[PDB]
Nucleic acid binder design. Sequence first.
RNA 1: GUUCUUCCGAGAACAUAUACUAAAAUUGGAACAAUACAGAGAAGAUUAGCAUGGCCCCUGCGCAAGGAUGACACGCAAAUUCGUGAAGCG
Length: 58
Amino acid sequence: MTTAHRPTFHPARGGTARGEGDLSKLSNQYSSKDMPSHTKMKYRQTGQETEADLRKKD
RNA sequence: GUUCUUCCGAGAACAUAUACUAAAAUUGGAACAAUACAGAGAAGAUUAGCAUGGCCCCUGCGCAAGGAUGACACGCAAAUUCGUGAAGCG
Ligand SMILES: [Mg+2]
Ligand SMILES: [Mg+2]
Ligand SMILES: [Mg+2]
Ligand SMILES: [Mg+2]
């Protein structure tokens, strides 16, 4: 019988790869996109119809 | 060891703790080249390719991509339990 060509009847699980569960388990090889980028965080301006002021604004 | 003190051969200050310390002696752990054999995924054959899984790697700068689809998988799969009437006995 053929059985190697099977789908995922069994559930997928994870949470144990490189650097998961312990921060020292990151290898010093890191991916090209793991470079620091977009490091200045944007925020929404003051008076953006913020929730409490919006609530007031019935 | 130096700049100074003098009663004279001593005194004050400056200077302040190197080194996985070995020229060694010991003790684990990987792949190498090839005589003969029989030889590489899918209900006949030629057989794609891409997936899926874990206490399996290798090449790669790599969330790219290759390594036979990289290899494997390839059936006792029972795993919460019964219910019935004939005929021997005794
Ligand atoms: Mg093929
Ligand atoms: Mg591949
Ligand atoms: Mg190939
Ligand atoms: Mg594969």
